[PDB]
């Protein structure tokens, strides 16, 4: 998608409309991303004229959108770090 709003919009469109706070979440994802970026809850409420504290559920649902879904493609690869000095200090008596 190369755009967080675009990917979020596609993910929301994938789900059914029966879920509550769907249209409001879509509206927020459309052009209200800046307030969430700054966590401007009061400014977002003033602008979008949304229900107070009812938008918290929609915000949580938007947080449950799995950002960067392509990250699952990446597989873990160990980082081969070879140390030079080893210290044990077993039962005290530290010996480098």
């Amino acid at each position: 998608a190369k755009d967080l709003r675009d990917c979020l919009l596609i993910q929301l469109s994938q789900f059914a409309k029966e879920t509550p706070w769907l249209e409001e979440a879509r509206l927020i994802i459309s052009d209200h991303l800046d307030l969430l970026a700054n966590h401007d809850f009061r400014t977002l409420m003033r602008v979008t004229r949304l229900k107070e504290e009812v938008l918290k559920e929609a915000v949580n649902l938007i947080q449950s959108l799995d950002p960067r879904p392509g990250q699952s493609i990446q597989t873990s690869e160990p980082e081969y770090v070879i140390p030079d000095v080893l210290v044990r200090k077993v039962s005290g008596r530290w010996t480098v």
């Binding site: 160990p78 980082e79 081969y80 770090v81």
Partner: protein
């Protein structure tokens, strides 16, 4: 093992050469039921990152 009632009689070919017919009672009696334990382990493997 278990002491199971048997008989030496060809039953419709279900004991053709080396085929054994079993009783639903034995399954109900749960005889020869086996329990197996499997082990799985994991490590952290601290990395450079």
């Amino acid at each position: 093992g278990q002491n199971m009632r048997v008989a030496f009689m060809p039953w419709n070919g279900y004991n053709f050469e080396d085929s054994i017919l079993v009783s639903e009672r034995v399954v109900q009696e749960d005889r020869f039921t086996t329990i197996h334990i499997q082990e799985l382990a994991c490590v952290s493997r601290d990395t450079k990152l």
